[PDB]
Specification:
Elements lengths: L1 E6 L17 E3 L2 E4 L7 E8 L3 E9 L15 E7 L12 E7 L4 E3 L8 E8 L2 E9 L9 E12 L5 E6 L15 E6 L1
Parallel strand pairs: 1-4, 1-13
Antiparallel strand pairs: 2-4, 3-12, 4-5, 5-10, 6-7, 6-11, 7-8, 9-10, 11-12, 11-13
This protein binds beta-D-glucopyranose and calcium ion (3 copies).
The site of beta-D-glucopyranose has 9 residues, from loops.
PDB class: hydrolase
Keywords: FAM9-2 carbohydrate binding module, glucose, hydrolase
Assembly: monomeric
């Protein structure tokens, strides 16, 4: 799976800047658990600049819940990055997993850090919008640079149980440990 992200700097606040319209929209259709018509999915747009990667995820989710003690089992969005795009079967120093729930609470998997994660969440009719900025750790991107990338939507029900796991490039729920499951994102001017 391949996608592109246009150069640009949006304001992280949960509001949709006009600039988001200049970049393509990708959908989370890779199902690991649940179904596209019954579980949470997101419409995603990506932008970038020399210091950060920006992600706008509009999540469809009629029932919001975060009762489960496991952060990945609360309604949330996870963002995966492979800066050198080695597509290894495990996380290298440059690889990271970031997570933020509908309450804008951040959690981190391997490689993720709050020092490199700025987020805002705005609830909308039928779901919520996540707008994030991830600071580059090991690279200073230039046009046509290609990174490994994925975005996952965790869907929890009224019972505090995760019933849906859907992402862009991974239908196996191994993104948290296997960068080879990420797709390719070309950073274009
Ligand atoms: O952060 C670790 C978590 O990552 C999530 O993407 C997976 O769905 C969970 O199974 C895993 O425990
Ligand atoms: Ca904004
Ligand atoms: Ca890597
Ligand atoms: Ca839900």
């Amino acid at each position: 799976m391949v996608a592109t992200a246009k150069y640009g700097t949006p304001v992280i606040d949960g509001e949709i800047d006009e600039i988001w319209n200049t970049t393509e929209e990708i959908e989370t259709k890779a199902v690991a658990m649940g179904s596209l018509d019954k579980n949470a999915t997101a419409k995603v747009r990506v932008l970038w600049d020399e210091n950060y990667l920006y992600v706008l995820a509009i999540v469809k989710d009629p029932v919001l819940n975060k009762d489960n003690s496991n952060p990945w089992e609360q309604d949330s969005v996870e963002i995966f990055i492979d800066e050198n795009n080695h597509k290894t079967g495990y996380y290298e120093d440059d690889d990271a997993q970031f997570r933020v729930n509908y309450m804008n609470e951040q959690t981190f998997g391997t490689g993720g850090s709050p020092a490199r994660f700025k987020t805002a969440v705005k609830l909308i009719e039928g779901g919520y919008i996540v707008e994030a900025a991830i600071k580059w750790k090991t690279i200073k991107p230039t046009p046509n640079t290609v990174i490994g990338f994925n975005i996952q939507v965790n869907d929890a029900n009224e019972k505090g149980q995760r019933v849906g796991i859907i992402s862009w490039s991974d239908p196996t729920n191994n993104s948290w440990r296997d960068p080879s499951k990420f797709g390719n994102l070309r950073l274009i001017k």
